[PDB]
Design a protein around this ligand. Sequence first.
Ligand SMILES: [Ca+2]
Length: 210
Amino acid sequence: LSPNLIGFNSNEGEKLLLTSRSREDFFPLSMQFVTQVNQAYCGVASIIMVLNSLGINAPETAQYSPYRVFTQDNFFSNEKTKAVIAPEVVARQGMTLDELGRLIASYGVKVKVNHASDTNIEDFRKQVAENLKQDGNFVIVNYLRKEIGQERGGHISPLAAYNEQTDRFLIMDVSRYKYPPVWVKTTDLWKAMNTVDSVSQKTRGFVFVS
Ligand SMILES: [Ca+2]
């Protein structure tokens, strides 16, 4: 972990959660926290945590039947979801911010896609900190890891909390074998999102889900 990041796996990072006043999302997300199948699946891992947490229409498949639950393995059972982008494609190249939006929307939830180029840090910080206080509203961020001092390319993960005192957001990093959840300064996360994803030729950003 680069010195700009506070790992959740530390006394400081636990305390940032205990002193946070915008942390409602942490509880349900922690209950659904999963490991990405692989890097290309970071967005799928992220969507299913949020979709399980929203309690929507879950897939009904053999794996867990009679139980209905979102899983990375069953996420593409939804015919509309497959139509957005082939499962095979996502398994190799991941998904863009717009695709993340469309994939979530395909399960009938309300989604607002926010490219960094269409907003600014003040509005991001403010709107997300609000969201993190509300139940039934989740945020997933899409960012370039290396801009926050992490190893490398574009990533997707849900946000769990905002710490007012330190102006840091908690990223529930689905790459759990690689990194812990991390408390990132809003300015680092902004710079990381304000990057052009070469696959979309568009800026990264964040999605609201309810
Ligand atoms: Ca929320």
